[PDB]
Amino acid sequence: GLSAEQIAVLQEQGFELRDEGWEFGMSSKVLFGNNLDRLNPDSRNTLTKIARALLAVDIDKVRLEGHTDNYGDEGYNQKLSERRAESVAAVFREAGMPAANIEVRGLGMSKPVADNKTRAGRSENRRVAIIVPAE
Amino acid sequence: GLSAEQIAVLQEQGFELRDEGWEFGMSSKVLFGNNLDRLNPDSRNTLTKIARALLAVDIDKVRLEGHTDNYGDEGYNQKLSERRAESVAAVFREAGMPAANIEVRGLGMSKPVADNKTRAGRSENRRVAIIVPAE
């Protein structure tokens, strides 16, 4: 049961509603640049800001999901996606979100959002979803 | 898109976000009893309240979609399902939603949410759905 005031904050922070709840997806290019799992300093501050905004209205559970394109080793992409999700998780922990309320998954190339047949598609598949689970 | 106060009312009213938008399904047995497209008075009562709740927060455009199971003449089931969706549009007009803002479709047997092999599945397929369009 999310209040209208909580929904307002999620909307202002850029979340959109999906099957699993309120989701804010950011591409890996925005989040990490040419880094591996170290966030761009700017992206990290941005994420700390989102985290504090949710917590201010007692939104204090998040699920963090990492994705890669299909290009490359499945196993490597899998670990990378997970480490990338964990980088975002750590920002939410330091921002004051309980470790038990934070869930981190690496989904590798399993859950595309765009077509791996094009270089532009693949780029969109490399991403981390911030989800606030709600039914 | 919809506001936080609107989303909250939809959720309260039992609507769920689906791929075509916010959807609230009602079984044809509850709506029509043994009638054809005549609503039974209790269901009329129930529908007026939903309309008013939506109307109270400027949700004044809906799509109403009637469905049947796969039993019987397909041509007849289309017509029955459209007529049933129309009975619901009339309640919504009378509650004050502009006629031009109501979209009626009879989908007959073509959009099942369950399996028609069993009586249980067939009864769930027999429904009218209220849709508030969305992103």
Author numbering:
A (entry chain B), B (entry chain A): 34 to 168
Question: What did the paper state?
Answer:
The YfiBNR system contains three protein members and modulates intracellular c-di-GMP levels in response to signals received in the periplasm. YfiN is repressed by specific interaction between its periplasmic PAS domain and the periplasmic protein YfiR. Previous studies suggested that in response to cell stress, YfiB in the outer membrane sequesters the periplasmic protein YfiR, releasing its inhibition of YfiN on the inner membrane and thus inducing the diguanylate cyclase activity of YfiN to allow c-di-GMP production.
We obtained two crystal forms of YfiB (residues 34–168, lacking the signal peptide from residues 1–26 and periplasmic residues 27–33), crystal forms I and II, belonging to space groups P21 and P41, respectively. The crystal structure of YfiB monomer consists of a five-stranded β-sheet (β1-2-5-3-4) flanked by five α-helices (α1–5) on one side. Each crystal form contains three different dimeric types of YfiB, two of which are present in both, suggesting that the rest of the dimeric types may result from crystal packing. Here, we refer to the two dimeric types as “head to head” and “back to back” according to the interacting mode, with the total buried surface areas being 316.8 Å2 and 554.3 Å2, respectively. The “head to head” dimer exhibits a clamp shape. The dimerization occurs mainly via hydrophobic interactions formed by A37 and I40 on the α1 helices, L50 on the β1 strands, and W55 on the β2 strands of both molecules, making a hydrophobic interacting core. The “back to back” dimer presents a Y shape. The dimeric interaction is mainly hydrophilic, occurring among the main-chain and side-chain atoms of N68, L69, D70 and R71 on the α2-α3 loops and R116 and S120 on the α4 helices of both molecules, resulting in a complex hydrogen bond network. The apo YfiB structure constructed beginning at residue 34 has a compact conformation of approximately 45 Å in length.
